[PDB]
C-alpha cells in the first residue's frame, strides 16, 4: 500500500468505524486547527474509514497547491457533490483534465467581460461599477424607507436582494426575474446548500447516513433540483432573445462560444458543459459576496470606533460632493483593510472545496496516494499563531502600512481566503471590487448600529461559508 522506504503522513489515534469524526464535532475547522497545532502542517486523519489528508500551514498549502499544483488539482468523488446541480459543475465535478480546463478559462474570461473589462457604452467605467453603484444607491433607499417606517431591518435580507440583482444582471442581462419570488426563495436560502456541501460533512464518509431520514439533505437535494430549474428556465428564455451580433451578459457570451465549438485535446466541449458555467458563475457569486457583505456590516454595527475611522477616511479623501467610484481604492486605505481584517477574522471559508490528488505524490516527504481526499484549512492559515498578532481580535490596522496611508502587500498575502494554485477563485478580484464600492457607497451615506441593550451573536456557523445568526435588529442613519 506504500512503495518502499516512504512514510505516510502523521495520523492520530482513531476509533474503529468512527475514526475521528466525533472529533470534529459541529466545527470541524476549530477541531483541525487544533489537531494540527499538535501533529503537524502535514497530518491525515480518517473520517470513518476514509483517509483525509489536512494542510494548514500557508507554505505547506502553497507547496501542495501551488507548486505541486498538477497534483492537487483534484475534486474528490464525494456524494453531496452527485447531488449538486447537473452532477456536471465546474467547481463540484470530479473532471479535472483537459476539459476542466477549458471550462474553467471560458468561465473566467465571460466572467471577467461584463464585470471588470471595461464597458464599451460606457466612458468611464467596468460593468461591475455600473452595476453596483446602481444596487449600492437603491439599497440606501430601501434602507432609509425602512427607517422611516418599522425602524429597523435586517442586514442579510437586504444584502441579499443587491448582490442578487448585480451577479443575475451580469449572467442574464435584462431575462433576470428581479421580481421572481422563484428566485428571491432561492438566493434567501442558500444556507440549505453550503450547509450540506462543506468539508467533512458525515454523510460523504459513511454510506448508511444517505438511506436515513434526514431532512438536511432533504433539503439540500430540494434546493438543487429548484436551483437547477431556475438556471436552466432562465438561460432557456434568454436564448430566445439572443443575438450572436450583440452579446450582451455572461449567458450570451457562452452562447455565441458554444455555438463556435470550444475544444479540449482536440475534441469538441459539449454545449451543455459550456451553458451550464452559469450554474457556478450565479451560485458562488451570489452567496459569498453576499456572505461576506453581511459579515462586514455586522463588524461595523458591533464596532462603531472602526465604523467612525472609516467614514472619517471617506470625508477627508473624497469629501461629500461626488460618491465613491473604484478608482478611489488604492486612496482608501482604511476601507480596504477593514475588508480584509472582514476577511481574516471571519474566514467565513474555513475550508476551501476539498481537493484532491491527481496521481501519487510526496509532500514534504510523506507519500500520498492517488485520489486522496485533502482538505485545506484557511481559517488555521488567518488564526496562526505564529502568523498574526492577537489572532482572536478583529484589527482592521494589522494590514495597514507603518504610517497608515496604504495597505501593508505583503502581510495582506498571508491572509488566504480565496484558495492558491489551479482551483483558485475565478472571481476574486470581481468580489474585492464589488465588496469595496458596496461598503463605500453606503458608508459614504448612512451609519449602521444596532439599539443600546440589544445583543449581538457573531458566532459563525460552519458550512462551505459560515453564515452568522439572523439579527433583524440593525439600524441606519444618516449623519451630518
Ligand atoms: C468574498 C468572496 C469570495 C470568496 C471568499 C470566494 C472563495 C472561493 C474559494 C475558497 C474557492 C475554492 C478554491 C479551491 O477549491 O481550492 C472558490 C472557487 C470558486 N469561486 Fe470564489 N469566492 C468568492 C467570490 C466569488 C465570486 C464573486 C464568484 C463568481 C462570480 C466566485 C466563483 C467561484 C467559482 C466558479 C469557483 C470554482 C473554481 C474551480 O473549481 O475551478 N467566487 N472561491
Ligand atoms: O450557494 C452556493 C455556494 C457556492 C460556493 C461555491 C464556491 C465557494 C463558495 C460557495 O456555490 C454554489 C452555491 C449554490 C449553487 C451552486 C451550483 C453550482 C455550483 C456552485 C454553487
Same mark, same amino acid.
Given at each position: ?49 476514509? =483517509?483525509? $489528508?489536512?494542510? #494548514?500551514? /500557508?507554505? +505547506?498549502?502553497? !507547496?501542495? %497547491?501551488?507548486?505541486?499544483? *498538477?497534483?492537487?488539482?483534484?475534486? =474528490?468523488? $464525494?456524494?453531496? #457533490?452527485? /447531488?449538486? +446541480?447537473?452532477? !456536471?459543475? %465546474?467547481?463540484?465535478?470530479? *473532471? ?385
Amino acid at each position: 500500500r506504500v512503495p518502499k522506504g516512504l512514510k505516510s503522513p502523521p495520523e492520530p489515534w482513531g476509533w474503529p468505524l468512527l475514526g475521528h469524526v466525533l472529533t470534529l464535532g459541529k466545527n470541524p475547522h476549530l477541531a483541525l486547527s487544533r489537531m494540527s497545532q499538535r501533529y503537524g502542517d502535514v497530518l491525515q486523519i480518517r473520517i470513518g474509514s476514509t =483517509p483525509v $489528508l489536512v494542510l #494548514s500551514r /500557508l507554505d +505547506t498549502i502553497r !507547496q501542495a %497547491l501551488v507548486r505541486q499544483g *498538477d497534483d492537487f488539482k483534484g475534486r =474528490p468523488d $464525494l456524494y453531496t #457533490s452527485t /447531488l449538486i +446541480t447537473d452532477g !456536471q459543475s %465546474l467547481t463540484f465535478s470530479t *473532471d479535472s483534465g483537459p476539459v476542466w480546463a477549458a471550462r474553467r478559462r471560458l468561465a473566467q474570461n465571460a466572467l471577467n467581460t461584463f464585470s471588470i473589462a471595461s464597458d464599451p457604452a460606457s466612458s468611464s467605467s467596468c460593468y461591475l461599477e455600473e452595476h453596483v453603484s446602481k444596487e449600492a444607491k437603491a439599497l440606501i433607499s430601501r434602507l432609509q424607507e425602512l427607517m422611516a417606517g418599522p425602524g429597523h431591518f435586517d442586514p442579510y435580507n437586504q444584502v441579499v436582494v443587491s448582490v442578487a440583482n448585480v451577479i443575475g444582471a451580469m449572467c442574464f442581462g435584462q431575462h433576470f426575474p428581479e421580481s421572481s419570488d422563484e428566485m428571491l426563495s432561492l438566493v434567501k436560502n442558500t444556507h440549505e446548500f453550503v450547509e450540506t456541501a462543506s468539508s467533512g460533512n458525515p454523510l460523504d464518509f459513511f454510506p448508511i447516513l444517505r438511506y436515513l431520514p434526514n431532512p438536511a439533505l432533504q433539503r439540500f437535494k430540494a434546493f438543487n433540483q429548484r436551483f437547477l430549474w431556475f438556471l436552466q428556465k432562465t438561460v432557456q428564455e434568454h436564448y430566445q432573445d439572443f443575438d450572436k451580433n450583440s452579446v450582451r451578459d455572461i449567458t450570451g457570451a457562452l452562447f455565441k462560444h458554444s455555438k463556435k465549438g470550444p475544444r479540449a485535446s482536440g475534441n469538441l466541449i459539449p454545449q451543455e458543459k459550456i451553458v451550464n458555467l452559469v450554474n457556478d458563475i450565479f451560485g458562488a457569486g451570489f452567496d459569498t459576496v453576499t456572505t461576506a457583505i453581511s459579515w462586514s456590516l455586522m463588524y461595523l454595527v458591533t464596532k462603531p470606533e472602526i465604523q467612525r475611522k472609516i467614514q472619517k477616511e471617506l470625508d477627508t479623501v473624497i469629501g461629500r460632493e461626488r460618491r465613491p467610484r473604484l478608482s478611489d481604492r488604492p486612496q482608501l486605505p482604511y476601507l480596504e483593510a477593514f475588508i480584509l481584517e472582514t476577511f481574516r477574522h471571519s474566514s467565513f471559508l474555513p475550508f476551501t472545496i476539498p481537493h484532491s490528488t491527481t496521481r501519487d505524490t510526496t509532500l514534504n516527504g510523506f507519500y500520498i496516494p492517488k485520489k486522496c481526499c485533502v482538505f485545506v484549512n484557511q481559517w488555521q492559515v488567518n488564526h496562526d499563531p505564529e502568523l498574526w498578532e492577537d489572532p482572536s481580535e478583529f484589527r482592521p490596522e494589522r494590514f495597514l502600512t507603518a504610517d497608515g496611508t496604504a495597505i501593508n502587500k505583503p502581510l495582506s498575502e498571508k491572509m488566504m481566503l480565496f484558495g492558491m494554485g489551479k482551483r483558485r477563485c475565478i472571481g476574486e478580484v470581481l468580489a474585492k471590487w464589488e465588496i469595496f464600492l458596496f461598503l463605500a457607497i453606503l458608508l459614504q451615506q448612512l451609519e449602521f448600529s444596532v439599539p443600546p441593550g440589544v445583543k449581538v451573536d457573531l458566532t459563525p456557523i460552519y458550512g462551505l461559508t459560515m453564515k452568522h445568526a439572523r439579527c433583524e435588529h440593525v439600524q441606519a442613519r444618516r449623519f451630518s
